[PDB]
């Protein structure tokens, strides 16, 4: 019929919206986790430099 087609269109539009939001959230999560692991490496490096300075002291 006709209204069934409208329902089919609507039931896919929200699917597209959800997929777009999912992609955005995935990108943001990956970027944040990469920054966090980089800061972990930074903290390890800072600990090593503190240890070396304590050795010189």
């Amino acid at each position: 019929m006709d209204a069934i087609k409208k329902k089919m269109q609507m039931l896919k539009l929200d699917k597209e919206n959800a997929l777009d939001r999912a992609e955005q959230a995935e990108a943001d999560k990956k970027a944040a986790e990469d920054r966090s692991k980089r800061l972990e490496d930074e903290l390890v490096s800072l600990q090593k430099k503190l240890k070396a300075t304590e050795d010189e002291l």
Partner: protein, 55 residues
């Protein structure tokens, strides 16, 4: 004379109605069969949308 004309006219007159009667009833039956076909097709997806009414 004109009597013969009357006999011929009346005799041929009966021909047209009776032959057309069968065609008329066949037309009615075929029309009704097609209408029933459409009604059977009509209610199915109608109820499907009734279920699909607001999901």
């Amino acid at each position: 004379d004109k009597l013969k004309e009357a006999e011929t006219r009346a005799e041929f007159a009966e021909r047209s109605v009776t032959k057309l009667e069968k065609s008329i009833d066949d037309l009615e039956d075929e029309l009704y069969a097609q209408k029933l076909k459409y009604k059977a097709i009509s209610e199915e997806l109608d109820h499907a949308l009734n279920d699909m009414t607001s999901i």
